[PDB]
Design a protein around this ligand. Structure first.
Ligand code: MG
Ligand code: MG
Lengths: 65, 192, 97, 57, 136
RNA sequence: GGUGCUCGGUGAAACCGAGCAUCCAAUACUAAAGAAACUUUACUGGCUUAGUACUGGGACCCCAUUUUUAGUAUA
């Protein structure tokens, strides 16, 4: 039941978003809406994701399977 | 006073507790070695009852019997606790916290006892003219756990203008030390 | 938003028009997604394996093009004995193979 | 100069040891006796001196 | 209701919105029956004297009136035809900052029914809402 | 064996000979200052129709733990 990775999907856009949330979304590797990337589970990725929880849809690899 | 242990709260559990109809609080005494404080949540009916029949800023002159209730080894618990600094609101005057102190029958707890003023109707100074002012209402002093005094009755049968009741002379129960004794400040004055 | 006066109609003459149930349904859906995001973050923090997972990433396009340019300018800047020297150890590797 | 400090140090120290021992005796004197005897013992006033006490001539 | 000082100084901010809900200047300290505000509003000296006489009309000589607010904040108002700019205007009137939890009129043992009667006339002449608080 | 208050001694040092307070080798109250902990809440970051749309951080003061003192007591 160990969370090996996370799957992060944009549900919002880039327009109207402040530049620092925009930079966090850039460094997560998300560019377009409805785009899902697979991210590791370490404290760096979790810090990036906790900065922007209202713009993304996070899900566990087991959940996505 | 039915309460529950309230494991982990900040300011968001407290807003949800207040919406759920509960009032938070804690008991702090170091009963066993360090303080081992216990967080608790009461109800607005219980807290309103204490602040109505005993009043706010008073109510610390009694040792209420707390009831630790589960929401058996879970539904058991009764502690002797004394109120300290009930947290009222300054707009709607609702009460948001209790902060009680555990008060076993032997204790050196500080108690803020009120002033009841025994004989306002009869005094020579009050009937020459006017009334009497009460500057130091609720004089606080040390007490014992099993003998906390609910009321302090200052004797006002014989006071006149320029005759003041000082904090130094007050009814002192046995084993109940006055906290501030070196001061000579006017608790009562016949101001006209 | 939040303007009643000033000649520009950002609102009706009444200073707003409050939330229809469609708007409240949309805000409830978005808040539910945000709550599941931070709950999933707490669960992933509490269930992270020791020696965490590294995923395979390729070189980005900038390193890739830079290092292909660098490798192509190694190829022009090689000495005369070099490809025979590489071929000798290439043969010697597969004699031991 | 060692002797010069020794004279004053020995004289002043012997005198202040005498005063502190007298202070010890007057501290321990007034305890085997009831409170009225304390009241006579703890009266902090003195009669003015009679001036007929001629000093070292 | 006037700034009892030597300097005709000037101010920058005219607001007092901050809440003191916990034990923070929320209990009565001089009287036993108190009148408090419920929302923040900067109020002028003329209103303070008008409410003070309006509730003093319902107060006997054996009832002290502990006022808690003193008008010591200069307010600068420009005259009618002055164009916008060219420095700060002259001091016109004195005002006070009122916070949502401040008791502004606290009374002694004048009866609670008469204290509630005085509160109604005070709240009629006052711009922001008023509330009843007692020593209890 | 410890710090000081100063008499002197040289080298400018710092220690030496004295002689009192505890450091050890006390308990029991009171008034100061600090230390770390913490309920509640102000205050805030993000979100925001301006907070029965939320969520993270989080004081000050009081109470309670305790340290450096000083003053008043004990045989
Ligand atoms: Mg956007
Ligand atoms: Mg918050």
């Amino acid at each position: 039941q160990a969370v090996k990775s996370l799957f992060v999907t944009l549900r919002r856009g880039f327009a109207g978003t402040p530049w620092f949330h925009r930079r966090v979304l850039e460094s997560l590797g998300l560019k377009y809406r409805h785009q899902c990337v697979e991210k590791p589970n370490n404290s760096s990725i979790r810090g990036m994701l906790s900065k922007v929880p209202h713009l993304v849809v996070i899900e566990t690899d087991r959940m996505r399977y | 006073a039915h309460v529950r242990p309230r494991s982990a709260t900040g300011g968001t559990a407290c807003k949800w507790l207040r919406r759920a109809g509960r009032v938070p609080g804690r008991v702090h005494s170091l009963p066993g070695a360090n303080n081992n404080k216990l967080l608790v949540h009461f109800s607005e009916g219980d807290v309103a009852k204490l602040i109505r029949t005993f009043g706010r800023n008073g109510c610390t002159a009694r040792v209420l019997q707390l009831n630790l209730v589960a929401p058996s080894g879970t539904q058991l618990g009764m502690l002797r606790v004394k109120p300290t600094r009930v947290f009222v609101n300054a707009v709607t005057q609702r009460v948001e916290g209790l902060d009680l102190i555990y008060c076993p029958p032997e204790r050196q707890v500080l108690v803020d006892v009120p002033v009841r003023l025994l004989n306002d109707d009869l005094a020579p100074g009050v009937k020459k003219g006017g009334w009497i002012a009460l500057f130091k209402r609720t004089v606080r002093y040390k007490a014992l756990g099993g003998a906390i005094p609910p009321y302090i009755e200052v004797n006002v049968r014989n006071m006149d203008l320029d005759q003041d009741m000082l904090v130094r002379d007050m009814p002192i129960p046995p084993g109940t030390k006055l906290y501030e004794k070196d001061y000579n400040a006017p608790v009562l004055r016949c101001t006209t | 938003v939040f303007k009643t006066t000033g000649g520009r109609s950002w609102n009706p003459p009444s200073g707003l028009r409050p939330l229809s149930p469609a708007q409240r349904r949309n805000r409830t859906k978005n808040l539910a997604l945000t709550m599941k995001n931070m709950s999933i973050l707490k669960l992933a923090e509490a269930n992270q394996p020791e020696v965490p997972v590294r995923l395979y990433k390729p070189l980005n396009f900038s390193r890739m093009q830079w290092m292909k340019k660098k490798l192509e300018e190694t190829r022009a800047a090689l000495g005369w004995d070099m490809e025979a020297r590489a071929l000798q150890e290439q043969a010697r590797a597969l004699r031991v193979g | 100069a060692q002797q010069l400090q020794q004279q004053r140090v020995a004289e002043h120290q012997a005198w202040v040891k005498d005063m502190t021992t007298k202070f010890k005796l007057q501290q321990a004197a007034l305890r085997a006796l009831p409170e009225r005897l304390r009241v006579l013992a703890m009266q902090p006033d003195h009669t003015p001196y009679p001036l007929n006490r001629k000093f070292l001539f | 209701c006037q700034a009892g000082q030597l300097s005709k100084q000037r101010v920058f901010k005219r607001e007092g919105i901050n809440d003191v809900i916990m034990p923070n200047t929320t209990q009565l300290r001089y009287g036993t029956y108190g009148i408090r505000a419920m929302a923040s509003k900067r109020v002028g000296a003329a209103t303070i004297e008008a409410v003070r006489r309006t509730l003093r009309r319902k107060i006997k000589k054996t009832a002290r009136l502990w006022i808690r607010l003193s008008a010591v904040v200069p307010v600068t108002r420009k005259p009618l035809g002055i164009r916008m700019g060219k420095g700060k205007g002259v001091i016109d009137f004195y005002a006070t900052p009122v916070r949502p939890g401040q008791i502004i009129f606290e009374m002694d043992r004048v009866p609670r029914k008469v204290a509630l009667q005085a509160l109604t006339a005070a709240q009629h002449k006052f711009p922001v809402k008023l509330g009843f608080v007692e020593w209890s």
